[model samples]
Target chain A: MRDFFVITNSEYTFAGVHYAKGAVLHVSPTQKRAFWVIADQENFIKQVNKNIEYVEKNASPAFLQRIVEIYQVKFEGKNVH
Target chain B: MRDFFVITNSEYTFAGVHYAKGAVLHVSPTQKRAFWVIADQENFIKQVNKNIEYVEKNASPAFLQRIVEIYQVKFEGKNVH
Candidate 1:
């Protein structure tokens, strides 16, 4: 299983397969909105952590908490600070 | 011409050509670091604007300005609220 972020919501053809929004549906979670949620999501959590670290007490307090929730969804108790 | 953000700095294979970091380079302007500046870009501006709107005074003040800089690279003399 694999997961990534979404950049745009469009459609395109890849590897003879038709894709809505093309492969851009996963292009790193957008800070403009809630981070993307998808199946096969592990790396997404890692990216979330990075966002947490980089955005630590930097962005909107609400947005920051929102991102932290995404991390908790992965590790149950193992906290990365 | 296309431009997106970079998620990770890695290497991979794409199409008939070998790519360093594969295609993960152009994901979206990351909130973790300075956005990726690429050659031949346009949609990137649109994404930046979206970020600006969604992130309107939501994220770090510094990060907000950083993203704004990315937008200013394209649109000049454009004022925002």
Candidate 2:
């Protein structure tokens, strides 16, 4: 079986796919528990931050704001998962 | 863009992929929103029920229990979407 880890109040949700690098997945805020893997970490993070701004401005749901916050602070550098 | 619907308090979460049938996806309870697509609805539903029983016995997280319940009661027949 393939091994996986929980993000649980941690920085960075994904590290990379088992076979690829420079990739990340995006799932909707309602589907915060879901992920759709593709390829982009830094860029994805940037987009997430933008969404966070949008949500903040529009007063979106707390859950969406919370997820955006969790994702926003996860990366430390280029190799963030 | 491909259309998707909310399963909010609905009967089924996933219907089928745009190109296939008899397929279901499984993700960990933590990753409740994630889906790993594969071909097997009937068998998958059976397995989900077993997991629900296990979670009830083991006192798993409420979220996990809820997800199992959601998947447990989704299908009405072979053509559930």
**Top model number, TM-score:** 1
Tens digits of per-residue lDDT for model 2, A1-81 = 111111222222343313123223233333333232323432332321332222222222243345557643222122223
What is the C-alpha lDDT profile of model 1 across B1-81, one tens digit per residue? 022333223443222223333122222344333322243332555555544222221223232233333212221111221
Give me the displacement of residue B3 in model 2, in angstroms: 7.0
Worst 10 residues of 1 chain B by lDDT: B72-81
- Best model per DockQ: 2
Per-residue error for A21 in candidate 1, Å, reads 33
Model 1's TM-score against the true structure:
0.21
Question: What Cα-based lDDT does every candidate model obtain?
Answer: 0.30, 0.29
lDDT tens string, model 2, B1-81? Answer: 011111222123333323123223333323434243333643564565553221121222232233333222222122443
Model 1 chain A: weakest 10-residue lDDT segment is A72-81
